[PDB]
Amino acid sequence: MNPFASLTLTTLTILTIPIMMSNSNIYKTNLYPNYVKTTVSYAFTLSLVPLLMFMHTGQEMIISNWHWMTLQTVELSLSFKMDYFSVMFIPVALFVTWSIMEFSMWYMHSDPFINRFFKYLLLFLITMMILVTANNLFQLFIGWEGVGIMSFLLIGWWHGRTDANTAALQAILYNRIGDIGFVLSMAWFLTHSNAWDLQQIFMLNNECPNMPLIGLLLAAAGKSAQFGLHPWLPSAMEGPTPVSALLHSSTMVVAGVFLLIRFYPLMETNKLVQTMTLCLGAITTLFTALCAITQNDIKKIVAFSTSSQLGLMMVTIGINQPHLAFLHICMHAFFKAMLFMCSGSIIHSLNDEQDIRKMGGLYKAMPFTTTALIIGSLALTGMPYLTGFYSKDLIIEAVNMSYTNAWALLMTLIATSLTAAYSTRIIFFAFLGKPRFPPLVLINENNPLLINSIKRLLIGSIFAGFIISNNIPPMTVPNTTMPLYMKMTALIVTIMGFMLALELNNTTYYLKFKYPSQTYKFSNMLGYYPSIMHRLPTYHNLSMSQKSASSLLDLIWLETILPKTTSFIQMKMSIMVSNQKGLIKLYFLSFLITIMISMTLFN
Amino acid sequence: MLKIIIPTTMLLPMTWMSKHNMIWINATVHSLLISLISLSLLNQLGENSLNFSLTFFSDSLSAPLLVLTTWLLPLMLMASQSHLSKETTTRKKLYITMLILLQLFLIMTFTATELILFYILFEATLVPTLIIITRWGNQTERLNAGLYFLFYTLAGSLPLLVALVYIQNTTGSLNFLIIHYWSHPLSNSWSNIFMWLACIMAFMVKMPLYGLHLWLPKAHVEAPIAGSMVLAAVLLKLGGYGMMRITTILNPLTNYMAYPFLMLSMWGMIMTSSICLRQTDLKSLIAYSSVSHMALVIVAIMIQTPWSFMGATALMIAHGLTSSMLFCLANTNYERVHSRTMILARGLQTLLPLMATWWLVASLTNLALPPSINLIGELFIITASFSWSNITIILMGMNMMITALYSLYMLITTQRGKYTHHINNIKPSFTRENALMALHILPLLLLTLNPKMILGPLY
Amino acid sequence: SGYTPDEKLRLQQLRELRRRWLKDQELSPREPVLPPRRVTYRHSIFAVTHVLIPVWIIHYYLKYHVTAKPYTVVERKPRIFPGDTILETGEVIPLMKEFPDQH
Amino acid sequence: SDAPPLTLEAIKDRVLYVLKLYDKIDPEKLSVNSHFMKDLGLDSLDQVEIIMAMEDEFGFEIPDIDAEKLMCPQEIVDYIADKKDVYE
Amino acid sequence: SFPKYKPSRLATLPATLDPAEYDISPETRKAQAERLAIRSRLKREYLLQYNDPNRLGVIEDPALIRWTYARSANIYPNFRPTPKTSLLGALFGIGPLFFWYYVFKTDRDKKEKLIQEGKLDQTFNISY
Amino acid sequence: AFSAPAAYLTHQQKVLRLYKRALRHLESWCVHRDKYRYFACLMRARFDEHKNEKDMVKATQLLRQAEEEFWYGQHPQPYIFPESPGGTSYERYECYKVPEWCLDDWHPSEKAMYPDYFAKREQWKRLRRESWEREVKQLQEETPPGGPRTEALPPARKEGDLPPLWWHIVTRPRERPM
Numbered sequence A: 001m002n003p004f005a006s007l008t009l010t011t012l013t014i015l016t017i018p019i020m021m022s023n024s025n026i027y028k029t030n031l032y033p034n035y036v037k038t039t040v041s042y043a044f045t046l047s048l049v050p051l052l053m054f055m056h057t058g059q060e061m062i063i064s065n066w067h068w069m070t071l072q073t074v075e076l077s078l079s080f081k082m083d084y085f086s087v088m089f090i091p092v093a094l095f096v097t098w099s100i101m102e103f104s105m106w107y108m109h110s111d112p113f114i115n116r117f118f119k120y121l122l123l124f125l126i127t128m129m130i131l132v133t134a135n136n137l138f139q140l141f142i143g144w145e146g147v148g149i150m151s152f153l154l155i156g157w158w159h160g161r162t163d164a165n166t167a168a169l170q171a172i173l174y175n176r177i178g179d180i181g182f183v184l185s186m187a188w189f190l191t192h193s194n195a196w197d198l199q200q201i202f203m204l205n206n207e208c209p210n211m212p213l214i215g216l217l218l219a220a221a222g223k224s225a226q227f228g229l230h231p232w233l234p235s236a237m238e239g240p241t242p243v244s245a246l247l248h249s250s251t252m253v254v255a256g257v258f259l260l261i262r263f264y265p266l267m268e269t270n271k272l273v274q275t276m277t278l279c280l281g282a283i284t285t286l287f288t289a290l291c292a293i294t295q296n297d298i299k300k301i302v303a304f305s306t307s308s309q310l311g312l313m314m315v316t317i318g319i320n321q322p323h324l325a326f327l328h329i330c331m332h333a334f335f336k337a338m339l340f341m342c343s344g345s346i347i348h349s350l351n352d353e354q355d356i357r358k359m360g361g362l363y364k365a366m367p368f369t370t371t372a373l374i375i376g377s378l379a380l381t382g383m384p385y386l387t388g389f390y391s392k393d394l395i396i397e398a399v400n401m402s403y404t405n406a407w408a409l410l411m412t413l414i415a416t417s418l419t420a421a422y423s424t425r426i427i428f429f430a431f432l433g434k435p436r437f438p439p440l441v442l443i444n445e446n447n448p449l450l451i452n453s454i455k456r457l458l459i460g461s462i463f464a465g466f467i468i469s470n471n472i473p474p475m476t477v478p479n480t481t482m483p484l485y486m487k488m489t490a491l492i493v494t495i496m497g498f499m500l501a502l503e504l505n506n507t508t509y510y511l512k513f514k515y516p517s518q519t520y521k522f523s524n525m526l527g528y529y530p531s532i533m534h535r536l537p538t539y540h541n542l543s544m545s546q547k548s549a550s551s552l553l554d555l556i557w558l559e560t561i562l563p564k565t566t567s568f569i570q571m572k573m574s575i576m577v578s579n580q581k582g583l584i585k586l587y588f589l590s591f592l593i594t595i596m597i598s599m600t601l602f603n
Numbered sequence B: 001m002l003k004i005i006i007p008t009t010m011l012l013p014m015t016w017m018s019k020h021n022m023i024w025i026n027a028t029v030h031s032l033l034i035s036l037i038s039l040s041l042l043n044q045l046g047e048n049s050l051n052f053s054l055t056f057f058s059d060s061l062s063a064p065l066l067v068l069t070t071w072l073l074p075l076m077l078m079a080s081q082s083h084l085s086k087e088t089t090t091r092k093k094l095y096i097t098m099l100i101l102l103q104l105f106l107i108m109t110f111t112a113t114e115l116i117l118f119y120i121l122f123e124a125t126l127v128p129t130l131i132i133i134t135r136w137g138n139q140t141e142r143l144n145a146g147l148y149f150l151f152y153t154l155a156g157s158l159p160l161l162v163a164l165v166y167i168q169n170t171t172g173s174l175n176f177l178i179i180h181y182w183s184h185p186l187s188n189s190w191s192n193i194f195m196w197l198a199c200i201m202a203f204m205v206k207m208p209l210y211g212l213h214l215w216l217p218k219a220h221v222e223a224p225i226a227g228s229m230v231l232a233a234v235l236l237k238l239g240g241y242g243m244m245r246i247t248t249i250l251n252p253l254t255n256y257m258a259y260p261f262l263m264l265s266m267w268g269m270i271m272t273s274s275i276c277l278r279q280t281d282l283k284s285l286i287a288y289s290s291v292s293h294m295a296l297v298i299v300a301i302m303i304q305t306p307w308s309f310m311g312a313t314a315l316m317i318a319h320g321l322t323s324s325m326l327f328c329l330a331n332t333n334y335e336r337v338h339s340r341t342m343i344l345a346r347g348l349q350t351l352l353p354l355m356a357t358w359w360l361v362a363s364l365t366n367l368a369l370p371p372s373i374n375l376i377g378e379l380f381i382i383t384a385s386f387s388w389s390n391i392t393i394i395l396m397g398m399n400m401m402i403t404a405l406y407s408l409y410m411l412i413t414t415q416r417g418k419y420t421h422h423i424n425n426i427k428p429s430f431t432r433e434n435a436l437m438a439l440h441i442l443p444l445l446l447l448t449l450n451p452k453m454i455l456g457p458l459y
Numbered sequence C: 001s002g003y004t005p006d007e008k009l010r011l012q013q014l015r016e017l018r019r020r021w022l023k024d025q026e027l028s029p030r031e032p033v034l035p036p037r038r039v040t041y042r043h044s045i046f047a048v049t050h051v052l053i054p055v056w057i058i059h060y061y062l063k064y065h066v067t068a069k070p071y072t073v074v075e076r077k078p079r080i081f082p083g084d085t086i087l088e089t090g091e092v093i094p095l096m097k098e099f100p101d102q103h
Numbered sequence D: 001s002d003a004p005p006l007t008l009e010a011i012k013d014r015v016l017y018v019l020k021l022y023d024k025i026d027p028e029k030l031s032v033n034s035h036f037m038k039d040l041g042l043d044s045l046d047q048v049e050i051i052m053a054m055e056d057e058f059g060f061e062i063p064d065i066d067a068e069k070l071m072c073p074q075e076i077v078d079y080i081a082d083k084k085d086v087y088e
Numbered sequence E: 001s002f003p004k005y006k007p008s009r010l011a012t013l014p015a016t017l018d019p020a021e022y023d024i025s026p027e028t029r030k031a032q033a034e035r036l037a038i039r040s041r042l043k044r045e046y047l048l049q050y051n052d053p054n055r056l057g058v059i060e061d062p063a064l065i066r067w068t069y070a071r072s073a074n075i076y077p078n079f080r081p082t083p084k085t086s087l088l089g090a091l092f093g094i095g096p097l098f099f100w101y102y103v104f105k106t107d108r109d110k111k112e113k114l115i116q117e118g119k120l121d122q123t124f125n126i127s128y
Numbered sequence F: 001a002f003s004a005p006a007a008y009l010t011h012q013q014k015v016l017r018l019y020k021r022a023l024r025h026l027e028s029w030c031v032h033r034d035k036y037r038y039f040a041c042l043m044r045a046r047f048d049e050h051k052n053e054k055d056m057v058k059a060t061q062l063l064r065q066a067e068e069e070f071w072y073g074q075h076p077q078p079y080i081f082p083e084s085p086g087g088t089s090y091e092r093y094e095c096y097k098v099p100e101w102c103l104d105d106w107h108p109s110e111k112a113m114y115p116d117y118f119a120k121r122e123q124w125k126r127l128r129r130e131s132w133e134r135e136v137k138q139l140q141e142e143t144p145p146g147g148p149r150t151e152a153l154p155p156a157r158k159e160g161d162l163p164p165l166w167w168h169i170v171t172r173p174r175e176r177p178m
């Protein structure tokens, strides 16, 4: 009876078995990575069944199995939510993780600590499953912090490198800035609604006030790398390529957008929070695309692409289309994970080279990665009838036909054009020109793990969009009618971006040199935000931490007031009392004076 | 309660009659047995209390503190086994005698049905700690530190005694049960204001409160490892226990008398968390982190709400365990480096991987990672303060961020990076140190399964 | 410009010593002396010890302990459409009101 | 990676290969022990250009303080071998 | 005629742009020679203490101990009450306290007034 | 790196460093090979028009203005080799470098494995043990009065001698130890 709950819990629990076995003998052999990969594939195959049951019937469930503690009138229990979002996002994440692990078995073969890398990946996967399936705010916070800790531990994978540690600390700092708003939201919800459970929160909040939603938006901006707190995501590429492909591309970074999606009953009741979300998403996507258009590191460009897609999804949330944002999450997972996988294959085949200035003719030298990246870039740019079209096209149609900010609409259009433009830049600078790498050619794709892992994501990015779009029940009203020019606006702007980017890139062939302009310097240096914001605030804080707090107050004035003043006064009194020459003349003169004073004073 | 006090007393003749090469084994085994016996007190009841006799009683606030105090001694013995190796048998027996006397005084203090007996034992705890700090301390500043650790405390508590006897001249009794049942409000008067100050400043100074915390970095830096353990883990919680016990008679004056202390604590948490960012010493960093956590607990106690009390109790227990483990790790590093400086020893995960894992777990626990009891207390106090005022969260949020920063900073400077080339006396970690780390860290993760055991009487 | 003779001599000696040390860093064929002592099928056993047993345990735990308490597992009620039949009652649900169908 | 363990012979062959493609040096006159401004009559700018050409050839860049005193192909080979820890 | 680079505290001036690394005088060369000489003396001492096979400990650095003592245990003996120090201490140790006290007192006064008058909508505010 | 630094850099060294930096940033600007070759030859020519400048007060004004020009167009995102101090894999394998003296702390059970390597290890240790005693005297006699001026060490001058302070240079762990 009730196979749905049993299977939904079983996939999560069997994701945990290798963690327990990590203390056994298998962890000390070379079969551990294959063991973890097989476990993940089996979990995905098992979790495919609840998705089918939901698709056939619409089955929904919440499981409150273990009661943690009762604080007077508030009961905290281990509650799991198995709604549409959870049972739909488990298989996608599991499939992506399986592909990334199969890729890692080949990419990280030379790492002495590869079993630890695989167990770290599995721990991150478990934390993300906890975050996604959480039904109360406490479990959601547990997952929220677990994914952050796993990202911190995986970014600084190479402890010798200082830059990796700096990037990990930066990510922790920005995630804690988001955690401030998350804790604000939890505190307000428990103070007012008297429950961290989502059901009671939805029942007791007919019109949600500004404060809890502002806190949720702050947390979502913190973890999704919105414009205010963006640089940590581009900085997080110091870690190994699989970490960026799994964590900081498709799974962990969409957690803030998923948090905003989970609270869609409360988001539709507030109109100012929607405007703030729309503006934040628009500025994020535009700024990240403008930064990406002029970068030279492939990983940095793909990271900025991920940030732009996250900003677009935040725009979608701001225009009151949560299900469409979730759909875009699902498609972006596939194609962006495959894009990072192709980039990692290029880097590995090219002797640990990431800069595109030393990447030349790879269209023929290594064709499978070339065609995979071409398919992924076409899916990214919303080419019709691909995995990205069925989400991004609807995003554009919804944002064009909505009573929203016009500036945000313009920013979204320019962001899509710039997305097409830097996809063109990647293809042109990595696969079209003459070779520019060192003469010792070591290009090789002939490994079954790499080929199979890439081909699964190819099949995904080709057909999964159609399958998902045609196999889910409708959850929003369609834009049935459309102006002919407005219908093609996304396609027109994307084609215009292709044309302009290609025309501007083809000018580098010319035998003409010119110094960069102000706009190029602004865009190449990431808008100067990483410089100023990492030098002006921190220094000042650090300076104060030693000037006022440490030296001036703690070590000087707090020491002077109570203890040192007392010591000085007592020393002076002791000196005055004990400074007697030993003359009885003075002693008995004082005796006469006190005898005289007592009779007058006390009589 | 005598079934636990008597074995603690009998620990002394057993230590003094033991062989010159078997004192540590006997002390550790019998201390662990006493801790196992004291685990029975954890079975509290929702009713009044476990009133054993006229002199001793146990509550669900006293029970976790008693269990922690009993559990601390074996850890202190294992920590002190190393640096007392070249010590004469008589002096080692004296050290163990001081530790046993301190445990006995703390155990008698945590039950303390009568308030004057509570104060007498509260101050009796001051003598063995002072002797330990001033006698078995490596540096020359220890004496000065000891002086501070004495006088501050006494300066806080000498008025309290007068206040205490004054109460017994008016109320007629100092039994906590009669005090609770016959509580009467304090009118808004200058005399009542000064009685409130006399009652509160005694426990504020030992917690410590920001501005009265100058003795704590000195005492923790200059004391031996066992002294640092007992000061950070248990001796700091005496102020919180005393405040939660004595605030039953200060209402409703506290409703307006807690403003200076709330402001001082809410700003001193930020000040000490920022001080931790720029510190050249590990022990000072740990001490200032302890100051920040105790300031948060002070805020919780001053709010005076059920969630505040629950969070305060949980945070005291979790902070005691975490600070003890951090001090143990710092001492393990110091015993090899002999310098006590963060930047001299670097890149230790290449040489000591399991110690690096212990450092990571301790830093995560200090960083208040869910679902640890650290974050349980943190969130309880934060929500209670939010109910008290919606603006406090801002300060609290800042503190949280800063906390994580310095924690990971302590993890990154000492463990990550390149090792120091000219240090070639880094021997592999002994089984004793690893066992100490495990015995510190496993109780935390086991208590997070059953939080109600440390949530206090208001659960 | 260039190396001085002392620099050349020191460099040559240091590189000779370095090459000798690096060659000494190699391993003999028997160098890792391991002391021995003892005290479809793969997928078949994997599917039993890693999938079937967790399914059994969770099914037991949910069916006989979790559902023993009220409101632990709550299912959203199934969607109801005109013309359906309820298994519990057996009564047929009335259809629509034959709206005018044209294109 | 699957990178082969380059040897001293390979390093010397690649150094000579890079030097012979430099048409300012006579291919039939250049030797492994040939000096730059003395045996070949080059200039300092040509020396730094050779240094950079080898830098691109081997995928690693030599510091200026060490580059400005690498004057023979043999000592360039030996410097690269010492940097890459080549056995034979 | 290119735009000129303006050095700042957090973005200093490059060595190649130093207007003092050109107007070279024999005194400057002598100073550089003495700096190299003392640096070489220290390096030779450290290398002699470092390659000794009979050493089985940490090489004590007087500079590190001196830095730690200066940062920690020398601040007070060189402290002198001055108008700058007094004003900075008073500000940084008093102003934030009264600022936060005023903010929280105003907020709580508004909250208590709203409790007394009665329109705050305290529904479901059970746990406090 | 391996060579000791001097008290100062001459005009020749500064000119060479500027030329190398300009070429590197030019190839960063000029991505393609033919364009880079053309512009590098052109910049070498424009750098060569003032080779034979005689007076030093005029040759120092040319390089001073060349350092003001390079800064203006220095490509704020230059190309860096992966193992360079700015590269993506600069200190990637720095945590795998374990010192040799750590092998002195191995358990005898672990030292039962690899016996020949350890035998060679005591051989090397003995060699160092006599060599250091020789090198102390050699370096003490060869040093000038008042202390060294440059941190360049002399080589070995006798037959059985080894260069002073050689243990920590030849016993580098590896480039990629693991």
Ligand SMILES: CCCCCCCCCCCCCCCCCC(=O)OC[C@H](COP(=O)([O-])OCC(O)COP(=O)([O-])OC[C@@H](COC(=O)CCCCCCCCCCCCCCCCC)OC(=O)CCCCCCCCCCCCCCCCC)OC(=O)CCCCCCCCCCCCCCCCC
Pocket: A290, A293, A294, A413, A414, A417, A418, A421, A425, A493, A496, A497, A500, A501, A504, A505, A508, A514, A515, A516, A517, A519, A520, A523
């Ligand atoms: C309704 C009708 C619909 C139809 C509408 C009309 C159709 C389209 C019309 C066309 C419109 C513009 C098209 C031109 C595209 C630009 C291409 C170009 O010329 O770049 C080269 C040129 C510099 O080239 P370079 O430095 O010599 O090259 C370096 C090397 O070659 C090294 O180069 P590299 O190899 O490293 O890489 C080259 C890279 C690097 O190049 C760069 O330097 C990047 C800079 C270019 C990005 C700008 C594009 C979009 C700008 C959005 C700005 C939003 C507002 C920003 C707010 C600023 C606040 C001050 O360039 C690229 O890869 C391609 C650039 C982007 C082209 C692709 C997308 C653009 C087409 C679509 C745009 C709009 C149509 C959307 C349709 C919506 C429907 C209406 O860029 C510029 O000169 C900038 C031009 C535009 C900048 C706008 C911002 C100006 C703000 C200044 C201050 C103003 C006052 C504010 C006061 C505020 C007080 C509070």
Ligand SMILES: CCCCCCCCCCCCCCCCC[C@@H](O)O[C@H](CO[C@H](O)CCCCCCCCCCCCCCC)COP(=O)(O)OCC[N+](C)(C)C
Pocket: B188, B189, B190, B193, B197, B210, B211, B212, B257, B260, B261, B264
């Ligand atoms: C240094 C590290 C921290 C240590 C502890 C610091 C905290 C100590 C502060 C103790 C609480 C505040 C002290 C006095 C509180 C009384 C209430 C007062 O603040 O409110 C006003 C009182 O105004 C003035 O405060 C009156 C007293 C003024 C003289 C006192 C000196 C103030 C500054 C002294 C600073 C010295 C600090 C160090 C001491 C060693 C309202 O006036 P009013 O409503 O009509 O009368 C209230 C009292 N009634 C109701 C009983 C009649």
Ligand SMILES: CCCCCCCC/C=C\CCCCCCCC(=O)O[C@H](COC(=O)CCCCCCC/C=C/CCCCCCCC)COP(=O)(O)OCCN
Pocket: B152, B155, B156, B159, B162, B163, B166, B191, B192, B194, B195, B197, B198, B201, B205, B212
């Ligand atoms: C680390 C340093 C901390 C030092 C201690 C700080 C707190 C000091 C508080 C005052 C101490 C003594 C208080 C008296 C104890 C309570 C007894 C009481 O309340 O009875 C009052 C007595 O009240 C008093 O006598 C109080 C007078 C205070 C004398 C000592 C002054 C000490 C310094 C005062 C200023 C310090 C206050 C702030 C200190 C901040 C912390 C340093 C009523 O007397 P009756 O005559 O019976 O009733 C009147 C109607 N018939």
Ligand SMILES: CCCCCCCCCCCC(=O)SCCNC(=O)CCNC(=O)[C@H](O)C(C)(C)COP(=O)(O)O
Pocket: D043, D044, D045, F011, F012, F015, F022, F025, F026, F029, F046, F047, F048, F050, F051, F052, F053, F058, F059, F060, F062, F063, F066, F067, F069, F070, F071, F073, F074
């Ligand atoms: C993209 C960034 C562009 C940056 C552009 C920077 C400016 C480029 C133009 C530079 C202008 C000049 O030439 S500035 C001219 C500086 N002054 C001199 O060159 C005079 C004396 N020259 C020497 O002594 C040299 O060493 C020499 C003899 C050449 C070789 O010596 P060798 O025989 O020992 O190799």
